Amino acid sequence: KWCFRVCYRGICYRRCR
């Protein structure tokens, strides 16, 4: 269980899996 910074269509975020 660790969070990370991810991106997509010109958009990024920080999801925790």
Instruction: Report the distance separating Cα 12 and Cα 17, nearest Å.
Output: 16
Paired strand residues for 4: 15
Q: Are 1 and 17 in contact (CB under 8 A)?
A: yes
Amino acid at 1: K
Instruction: Report the distance separating Cα 10 and Cα 16, nearest Å.
Output: 20
Residue count of the chain, please give it: 17
Q: From which experimental method does this structure derive?
A: NMR
What is the Cα gyration radius of the chain? 8
